[PDB]
Structures are given as C-alpha cells and as structure tokens.
Amino acid sequence: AVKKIAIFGATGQTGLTTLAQAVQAGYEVTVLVRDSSRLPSEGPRPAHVVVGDVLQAADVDKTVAGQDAVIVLLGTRNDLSPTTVMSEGARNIVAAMKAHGVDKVVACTSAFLLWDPTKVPPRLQAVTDDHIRMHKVLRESGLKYVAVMPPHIGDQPLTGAYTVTLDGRGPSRVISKHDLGHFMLRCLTTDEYDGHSTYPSHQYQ
Numbered sequence: 306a307v308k309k310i311a312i313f314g315a316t317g318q319t320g321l322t323t324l325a326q327a328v329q330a331g332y333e334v335t336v337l338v339r340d341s342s343r344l345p346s347e348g349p350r351p352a353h354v355v356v357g358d359v360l361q362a363a364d365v366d367k368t369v370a371g372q373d374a375v376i377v378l379l380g381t382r383n384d385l386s387p388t389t390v391m392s393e394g395a396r397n398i399v400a401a402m403k404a405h406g407v408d409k410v411v412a413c414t415s416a417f418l419l420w421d422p423t424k425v426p427p428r429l430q431a432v433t434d435d436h437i438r439m440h441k442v443l444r445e446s447g448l449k450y451v452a453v454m455p456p457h458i459g460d461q462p463l464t465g466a467y468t469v470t471l472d473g474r475g476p477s478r479v480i481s482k483h484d485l486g487h488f489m490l491r492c493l494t495t496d497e498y499d500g501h502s503t504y505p506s507h508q509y510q
C-alpha cells in the first residue's frame with residue numbers, strides 16, 4: 306500500500322487541506338514549496354519539506370525520490386495569464402517519477418476538460434489551455450494516472466459523501482476543497498480510476 310507521498314501545490318487552497326488530511330490519515334508526506342511561511346504551524350505537519358520550485362528539475366527530483374505516489378495540486382493562484390507552469394511542472398514530475406521508479410500520480414486539472422470545450426469562460430481559457438497541456442503530459446507518460454477534473458472548488462465542510470462520475474455530469478457543479486482533497490487521497494488506495502478522468506461533485510445544500 307501507499308505510505309510515502311509527495312504533494313505538489315501543498316500551500317494552495319486545496320493543497321493545504323489535502324496535506325492536513327494526508328498527515329492525519331497516516332501518510333508520510335513530503336512537500337515542495339517555494340515559500341515555507343505559507344505552511345501552517347497549527348494542525349498536522351508534513352514529514353519532509355523541500356524548498357524549491359516545480360520548474361527546477363533538481364528540486365522536483367529531490368521531492369519525488371523515495372515516494373510511493375504523487376499528488377499534484379499545482380495552480381496559478383489568482384493569475385489568469387498565459388502560462389506553462391503547470392505543464393512544465395508536470396514534465397519535471399514525470400521525469401522524476403521515471404528516474405525513481407514511482408508509478409502513481411493523481412493530478413488535478415478542471416471539469417472544463419470534460420465539459421463542452423467551447424463553453425470555457427474567456428478569462429479562464431489560458432489556464433485551461435495549460436491544464437490541457439498538463440493532462441497530455443500525464444496521459445502520455447504511461448504511468449498510472451488518475452485525472453481529477455473538479456468543478457468550482459468551494460469552502461463547504463468535509464463530508465466524504467460526494468459523488469464521482471467519469472463524464473462531468475453529476476449532482477452539482479461544486480466540490481468543497483476538503484472533499485476534493487479527500488478524493489485525491491481515496492485515489493491512492495484503489496486502482497479503479499487509473500487511466501480515467503473523474504468528476505467529483507456534491508450538493509451541500
């Protein structure tokens with residue numbers, strides 16, 4: 306079973322709760338962070354912290370070495386500009402996984418990669434184009450890859466009661482950040498989603 310994981314994007318909205326949940330669940334967690342002040346003092350703490358950048362192959366290599374699986378929650382925070390950060394990061398992650406024998410990656414893009422592709426809001430098209438590039442990198446890697454394609458990420462509580470479909474239709478167009486992290490972790494203990502795209506959603510009201 307998976308025991309050691311690396312999380313990329315651990316200081317982001319979804320990353321922080323995925324990190325806390327992973328530690329609480331008993332995983333030995335390594336994170337790559339550019340700025341360690343963005344990790345919390347309170348609550349569960351990662352076992353290992355690598356300071357560095359996902360665009361630097363050597364930093365990624367140090368983070369992936371010795372792991373059983375990788376969770377990818379990279380993103381651009383509020384920046385909607387044209388970008389290759391996520392896809393170039395994914396290229397480095399795949400290379401490091403292959404160099405170190407790691408064969409399982411669970412990575413977040415977005416439900417826009419399941420929905421009608423002519424229906425992406427213009428302001429999100431540039432980020433979506435890089436999610437598509439990252440999905441291609443991961444699909445073509447040959448590694449066991451679970452593509453997680455969430456709708457709007459909300460602040461609702463953790464429930465563990467969301468629905469996962471394979472086609473982008475479901476009970477709602479929202480998933481709480483906590484539930485999304487819980488799902489990422491679920492993907493570490495089953496092979497049922499390997500090679501598939503997944504759509505987690507739930508009605509919180």
Ligand SMILES: NC(=O)c1ccc[n+]([C@@H]2O[C@H](COP(=O)([O-])OP(=O)(O)OC[C@H]3O[C@@H](n4cnc5c(N)ncnc54)[C@H](OP(=O)(O)O)[C@@H]3O)[C@@H](O)[C@H]2O)c1
Pocket residue numbers: 313314315316317318319320337338339340343357358359360378379380381382383390413414415416432455456457458459
């Ligand atoms: N917002 C939504 O409703 C929504 C819906 C569906 C999908 N998505 C997608 O879901 C994914 C996760 O979203 P989120 O809101 O949880 O993410 P987020 O808050 O934007 O966090 C991005 C994370 O990636 C890290 N990162 C960015 N560039 C990096 C670099 N060069 N090296 C190392 N780490 C780097 C950030 O580090 P720092 O802390 O150092 O900045 C942060 O940890 C994103 O790809 C997003 O586009 C979002």
Ligand SMILES: O=C(O)c1c(Cl)c(Cl)c(Cl)c(Cl)c1-c1c2cc(Br)c(=O)c(Br)c-2oc2c(Br)c([O-])c(Br)cc12
Pocket residue numbers: 382383414415416417426429432455456457458478
């Ligand atoms: O209308 C939006 O898209 C939007 C707006 Cl208009 C506002 Cl105000 C806010 Cl806060 C957010 Cl989070 C979003 C949003 C999002 C909303 C819905 Br509905 C949805 O189904 C999906 Br998929 C969404 O994907 C996003 C991705 Br990809 C991002 O990287 C960011 Br950044 C924001 C979104």
